[PDB]
Design brief:
part of a larger assembly; 3 chains; mainly alpha; Fumarase C, Chain A, domain 2; two-stranded parallel sheet; 60% helix; Aromatic_Lyase (chain B); EC 4.3.1.24 (chain B); Phenylalanine aminomutase (L-beta-phenylalanine forming) (chain B); phenylalanine ammonia-lyase activity (chain B)
């Protein structure tokens, strides 16, 4: 299952202490992302040093012997320092690019001197990186302009500014000086080896793919939480449905969901709900839940396949010419053409838009009383709704997020211009595409943060609902006895207490126009008819007036007590405990001062910085 | 002509000191951009005080009467629920202050029911450079820009969680920020929460600075087509008013008019004519489309940007909340003026027009870089002479492809992605703010493209003038050596024609190389002159060749070094050349000039971004009527 | 108002008999669509002839004395290399004939140097219904619509490989077609190849019929917003002049002005006001955005479609070949009028606005289908009464999502995809014909959406009229039965309130089902009256009221409905539409008892939209508006 592969990705990301750069051990997107995000992760270049020097020698002798092989170093770098600071590629991306550039050389096809590789290693471990303009690459003879800034650092160009950690910016030659390095004087083919690769596009695409797997698994998992809160029928995940339409991502997501929902205490509440007034409620869930596995299928497959493609690129020699020193020939091709990454970046951006639309459809259902099976509009607790608009602000923002996300998912690869004196008449635009997919993942993080917040709100509201119906049942039950109503009447009255959704009358429970009093009034009239008397009327008028003696006070009490349980038996407990306890939040209401921003910011940040993987792994403990 | 309207917008942007906010004087996009970009510009709210208070009183009396009018603590629960954005990024100070201005102006029509006091507070926060930190995303611009506008409202009521900027340095919680400029948190009354948040002010704000930039950069692109004509050796006839008289799109007529005027009696057009007189049958009789069809291309782009400005300014000058209080006839009118659709649709159109400007620039740049298309210019605009270590503007060329590709992608529509939002109440919604942001991003790229193009054309100006001086040196050396060696009058004329005809950039790298076009051209003539007419003729022709390779390279080198250490002086585009070269302190690009292309183009880009580029533009255009 | 301008366009389309091609009288998009769609309309080329010949002879003079002028001083080799299309699909005869008109018209300015005799042959081919079969693709509309226009030239010179249509079935090689209409193949003179192939006539032809339809459908959509207001129980206040005065986008003012006028004396707005006065506090105080913000939404759409109309007409009335022959001053001028960019960009914009029109329609239709949003109407506009076998307009609802989705997809721009073309000579090119074609496909879909929307609203009128009648029956049955059982005034007034208040479509399926809202509300009031008047006698009479209700009430609801199946619309400005759809097209309220499928009903409406008949009830509806 892709579920276990993604868990393995998350574990490797968390665990790794050293990245082995050796020309043989694959670097994964978890490693790239760990190097980028955890500064205690260090690069360890292993002395492959043999084939690197052989290659280097072959090129360096074909220069002393003055052979003539096509593919002065500073003039290439000078013409490529052609970006403009409007915005810039971040340090995480630049350091990622440095690693991929370093790695590309280990295969001994590039001809760069080993010491330059050592210099890359040192700069990475020292947190030194050049400041690199955002735009300029068409990713075809490589990410020429942006990679030119890394080469510019290595030769100590004064106009290239370098970061050292988060606070220090110094000109290139001073940055080299501070790490015990001297400017390089570039040798034959070395300018081309540094600039003509796919390392920047592939860097962005690596952090993008790592993020895509994590958010994918997170969205898939949270479909189970959605089922629980919406009162879904878990049967949509039944293995047979998916065995007869056997898209691997359809089987595998359904598999996880069947497992997440199997012994669910909310599924138990769902069953009791559809048993009451059975033939007046929907027989099936709406599509955002019920067809989630079918929806997820191509998205899982796209994100998994793109990961393979990007990792192949991470582990490639991607400059030109390729030096076949063994056979004494320089090979003229175009491994710097980033099309594998470019095309898949367009595809993943479409899959991410599809994940966003799934979230938006689910969130929409949750906000609307007609579609939420008992939950209040906007997940508003009230009880006073005139001053509690609940999650309406987050609802509007989810439309804002989905709309921009769908716009972002138009392709970049369809916009190929005939470039560089028509030499690059096809070019991948991989870095541009990767940037747009990254931007699309930023918006999906917002949507996840919002969706999880809303579901924790719904958990609270479902737990509060169950306790409120119990209060009502007890108040009706005991008052019925005290007024001396017959058992016919008592049971009829109790059915109403059970059946009427509590959020439809919580605002003013004893309001004669609201659904509780309406149901009791019709039951009182049917009792009079079934039993016919003047005494029965006395006790029924007594029952009704004595409703506003106790009911409201007891509903308020059990509520206020909740503000100051089924989730404990649910596989999503870790998520709820993380958002409520660890992040320090509570059921949203007019009485809680925190804005939706404050609550959702906490969840968003935990998604951003990877803390959310903790409750996620917890939740999936034992899944095989 | 749109040319004078844009010049009017630029003059207004530079001159304005105070923006009059009174409910009758129009705010234009130039006013919005000046408030945003020049802090010396202050807000002047004029005591319209009468109509605002009347409306405020109506609303308040109707609530105090306990009357039941819909949309008229209730107010603070609205703000609370809308403080719902997330910091990932933010709308910048310039957009937020722009919005604050637009929000203030909308109240001045007295339809909103906000108190005058709150308005005075807005005025003072503006002039005191105070503005809330606002999350980038969350608005669908339909019941207004509810989320981002809530942050302005949050500041006004002293919400502790709303962070506020004071200048570029200071950041403090909203209550403290109100304190520091002598204000107290407001307690909001009937309809005031809704008046503050339910507007189109953020999208319209971004769209105002977007439209200002679109106007300036449009005029800049049109004008620079004239510069392109000069350096590329174009035929100015493409601009002849008769061509456009019979295909009369106003933008076509007006762009052609500007171009005819810029190119009339151009000293560069004189070199162009000379050039096409030598080897006429071997050279194109018409320019390529990126020059020759420029007025036809510009026409819809001009009209789109002009019409969009009008639509955006209409929005700037609107009451855009709900209900609209008709205090005079005692009704709250229920509509949807907060629906930002006019701005949203036009932002999509303007983004397509901006993409069209980018494609025009890309195509022109491409021609200029390629020797086959540049009518004598060296590939990549490399001076060399040694091309093995000078790749000229090849990096800028690649980047222009990168810029255009992303520009074209950005130009897909946002308005086609309407979701059924807010419990299906907002089943249509404009997405204006999102569209405005994308068009803004598209203009960022256009600026990069304009900066590169201008830098490249200044390079080509230098290369054209150098070319003229180089060819005259080659003629003079050929003439004086033909005399010295005692060559026949026929031989002399035939050799001097070759010196005139051969493009000098085809042999600059090694002028006396026998395999390069000058020597090939002279060798053909030499054989021809021998046929028309002996051993002593061969003798003098070998002496010619010999003495050529003693003298020619040195005199070429000398005149080049002198240039490095003129027709542009009579060009309408001198202000641009003088600006880039002198004011910005640059020179002809080559291996000998240490500064990178980044350093040069950056200077140009910054001058476009900060407005300095308008100075040479206005100078260039002086007298055009 | 743009409304008058569009009404002018429709009147012109209808009443034009001859198109004056003279080089001074403007051809409008109505004239182009008239020519394409009404074969009785003839071209009248009015001898203009003098300048054509002056230009012609100037070109021929230079050919004689051997002057040398680029682009003028061969043709059959140009035509040959441009006959490079492939039949996969073709440009329709209507597009080709429109292109022939525009090419003819372009020549009338005397700037092209084409022979008057070639012009007369164009007129004759037009009036005789001859046109070449033209492949669909190949134009980038930059040095003109070169490939498709080559097929017009190929017809004129009698290229055998060029197949010509004559009317709807007849297809003959070009020599045969010319011979059937009394013409002979031309031998092209200097500059005539270019005159013919190097123009913008194809893109601008598709764009002309595109703009005529955009104008008509726009007005139709605007008008039907009022009909939507009527059937959905909207508040007409959204259209009030002061709202739009303070946000004065010209299209916002004018759309709302139209709507205020359509709704001013509405008998449906009267039912609406009455509806909101019952349970005022439980029902929404404002309409949803697809109605309430329709003026703000329509504003940019109105303005796009009108400005785009101007641009396309400017192009219809242009000389758009090259070089531009300035015979007066003995010069050929070298430019690029064949660059179709004015039309290309505006086609992209109009496609987006059409998508915005479709989205407006989709959101309206959506509200209409959902009982939560439709203020009394049944889900899916199902009449029933048995809803288990009547799913109503659910098919059309699904279809509307499909329509809107494909439409939004089509509205991406074409002009952002400019390639460097023709040996990099055409390094900018307009792609105008491609864009026009996509905007045309977008309009095809909008037509589908309008057809469905109008059909749904006619269904809703019927349901609303039945609703008023049904509630009256219920009130009467309750009022009479209260009397027959001697119920007190307290009881009678509570019971009659429930009869007026409960939406009839929530219980129509089984009016006496005790779990449905009529009986629920009746039981509630009965308990309330037993308490208020507090007895064994009252209970006796309330039980007899209930038993008599389930004997008589349903029978009388069925009778009134069965009668309806075998009024407020009569006072409504939308009567012409309703009358058009029900009587003229011969349709009826939709249900399980009506045999015709939703397909058969909507086809009829769509066909009337597609062939222009829908403009009759449209023009009738708008009579009086100034």
């Amino acid at each position: 299952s892709h579920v276990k592969d993604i868990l393995g990705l998350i574990n490797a990301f968390n665990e790794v202490k050293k990245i082995t750069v050796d020309g043989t051990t694959p670097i994964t997107v978890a490693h790239v992302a760990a190097l980028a995000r955890r500064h205690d992760v260090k690069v360890a270049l292993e002395a492959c040093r043999a084939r690197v020097e052989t290659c280097s020698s072959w090129v360096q002798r074909k220069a002393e012997d003055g052979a003539d092989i096509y593919g002065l170093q500073e003039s290439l770098i000078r013409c490529l320092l052609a970006g403009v600071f409007t915005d810039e590629l971040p340090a995480t991306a630049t350091r990622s690019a440095m690693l991929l550039r370093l790695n590309s050389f280990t295969y001994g096809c590039s001809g760069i001197r080993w010491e330059v590789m050592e210099a890359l290693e040192k700069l990475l471990n020292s947190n030194v990186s050049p400041k690199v303009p955002l735009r300029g690459s068409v990713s075809a003879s490589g990410d020429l302009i942006p990679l030119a800034y890394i080469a510019g650092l290595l030769i100590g160009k004064p106009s290239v500014i370098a970061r050292i950690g988060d606070d220090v910016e110094v000109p290139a030659p001073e940055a080299l000086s501070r790490v015990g390095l001297r400017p390089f004087k570039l040798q034959a083919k070395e300018g081309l080896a540094l600039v003509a690769g796919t390392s920047f596009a592939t860097a962005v695409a690596s952090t993008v793919m790592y993020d895509a797997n994590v958010l994918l698994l997170l969205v898939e998992t949270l479909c189970g939480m959605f089922c629980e809160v919406i009162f879904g029928r878990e049967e949509f995940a039944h293995p047979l449905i998916h065995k007869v339409k056997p898209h691997p991502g359809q089987i595998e997501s359904a598999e996880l969901l069947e497992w997440l929902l199997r012994s669910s205490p909310f599924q138990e509440l769902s069953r009791e709900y559809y048993s009451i007034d059975k033939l007046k409620k929907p027989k099936q869930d709406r599509y955002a839940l019920r067809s989630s596995p079918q929806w997820l299928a191509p998205l899982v497959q796209t994100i998994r396949d793109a990961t393979t493609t990007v990792e192949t690129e991470v582990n490639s020699a991607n400059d030109n010419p390729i030096i076949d020193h063994a056979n004494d020939r320089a090979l003229h091709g175009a491994n710097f053409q980033g099309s594998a990454v470019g095309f898949y970046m367009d595809y993943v951006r479409i899959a991410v838009a599809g994940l966003g639309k799934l979230l938006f459809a689910q969130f929409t259902e949750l906000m609307i009383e007609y579609y939420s099976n008992g939950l209040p509009g906007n997940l508003s607790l009230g009880p006073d709704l005139s001053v509690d608009y609940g999650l309406k602000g987050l609802d509007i923002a989810m439309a804002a997020y989905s709309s921009e996300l769908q716009y972002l998912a138009n392709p970049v690869t369809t916009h190929v211009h005939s470039a560089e004196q028509h030499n690059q008449d096809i070019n991948s635009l991989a870095l541009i595409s990767a940037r747009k997919t990254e931007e699309a993942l930023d918006i999906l993080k917002l949507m996840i943060a919002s969706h999880l917040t809303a579901m924790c709100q719904a958990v609270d509201l479902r737990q509060l609902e169950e306790a409120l119906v119990k209060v009502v049942e007890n108040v009706v039950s005991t008052l019925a006895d005290e007024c001396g109503l017959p058992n016919d009447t008592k049971a009829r009255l109790l059915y109403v207490a059970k059946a009427v959704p509590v959020y439809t009358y919580l605002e003013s429970p004893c309001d004669p126009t609201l659904p509780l009093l309406l149901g009791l009034k019709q039951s009182c009239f049917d009792t009079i008819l079934a039993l016919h008397t003047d005494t029965l009327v006395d006790r029924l008028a007594e029952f009704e007036k004595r409703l506003s003696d106790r009911l409201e006070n007891e509903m308020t009490a059990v509520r206020v007590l909740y503000e100051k349980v089924r989730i404990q038996g649910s596989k999503f407990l870790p998520f709820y405990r993380f958002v409520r306890e660890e992040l320090d939040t509570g059921v949203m209401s007019a009485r809680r001062e925190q804005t939706p921003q404050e609550d959702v910011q906490k969840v968003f940040d935990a998604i951003a910085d990877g803390r959310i993987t903790v409750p996620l792994l917890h939740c999936l403990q034992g899944f095989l």
